[PDB]
Amino acid sequence: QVNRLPFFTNHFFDTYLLISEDTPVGSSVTQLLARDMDNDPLVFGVSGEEASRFFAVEPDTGVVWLRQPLDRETKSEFTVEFSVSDHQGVITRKVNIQVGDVNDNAPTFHNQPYSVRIPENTPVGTPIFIVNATDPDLGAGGSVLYSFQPPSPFFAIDSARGIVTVIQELDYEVTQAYQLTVNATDQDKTRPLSTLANLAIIITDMQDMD
C-alpha cells in the first residue's frame, strides 16, 4: 500500500472557528485532529504569515495556542491555513476565524476639558451643557448612560442624551464654582464598565443684593 496523506477531522474546517477576544495569550484555542490511514506519525503546523503571528501550533499534537491578543474592535474575521504532514507529504486547509466580542472597553468622553460659565440667576430648568461619550463594544456593552456621581442637588443630567440642566437656584455668595463628576457606564449585563469625567461649572456673580 502506497502512502496516503493525512486528513483533518475537525468540524470547523467546514464552518468556522469562533474565538472570544478575551482568550488569554498562551491559552489553547483548539486541537487540530487528523487521521492517517497508514498510521504514520504526524506533524501539525500553521501556514501563512499573519496566521502564524496570532497562532502557534504544537507540532506533535496539533494544539493551537494564542500568541498575540485578538481584538474584535480591530479585526473580527480572517482566514488561516493549518497543516498536517505524515513526514512524506503535507496538506494545508483553510479555516474561517471569527473573533467574538466581549465588553472590554469603557466609554470615552469627547471634547474634554468640560467647562461652562453660567450666571447665578440662571433659571431652574435651563439646559447648560451636553457631555458626549462613545463606546465601541457591540450591543448593550456599547450603550452609554450618564449620571452625576454622587447625584447633584443643583444639576440634572439626562442619562441618555447627556444634557445638563439647572435644578435648584444658584447663589454665587455660597458657591462660586462646581466641579461635578460625570459617570458614563455601559449597559453590559454581566460586566459593565465605567469612565469618569469632570464638568466645571463657573458661576458668574450677579448684582443681586436684596
d(CA 59, CA 104): 33
- Quick note: the x/- pattern for Ca ion over 80-99, rule CB under 5 A, is ------x-------------
CB 20 → Ca ion: shortest distance, Å? 10
- Tell me which of 15, 168, 173, 177 binds Ca ion, using CB under 5 A: 173
Using CB under 5 A as the binding rule, whether residue 186 contacts Ca ion is answered as yes
Contact 77, 97 (CB under 8 A): yes
Q: Between 41 and 151, name the residue whose CB sits nearer to Ca ion.
A: 41
- Using the contact rule CB under 5 A, the part of the chain among 21-29, 42-50, 147-155, 157-165 near Ca ion is 21-29
On the question of a cis peptide bond just before residue 6, with omega within 30 degrees of 0, the verdict is no
- Using the contact rule CB under 5 A, the part of the chain among 7-15, 44-52, 109-117, 164-172 near Ca ion is 164-172
- Using the contact rule CB under 5 A, the part of the chain among 56-64, 66-74, 122-130, 151-159 near Ca ion is 66-74
152 Cβ neighbours under 8 A, 6+ residues apart: 167, 178, 180
CB 105 → Ca ion: shortest distance, Å? 4
On the question of a cis peptide bond just before residue 153, with omega within 30 degrees of 0, the verdict is no
Helix (H), strand (E), coil (C) string for 129-196 = EECCEECCCCHHHHCEEEEECCCCCCEEECCCCCEEEECCCCCCCCCCEEEEEEEEEECCCCCCCEEE
Which of the residues 29 through 48 are near Ca ion (CB under 5 A)?
Answer: 36, 38, 40
Residue type, 118: I
CB 19 → Ca ion: shortest distance, Å? 12
CB 170 → Ca ion: shortest distance, Å? 8
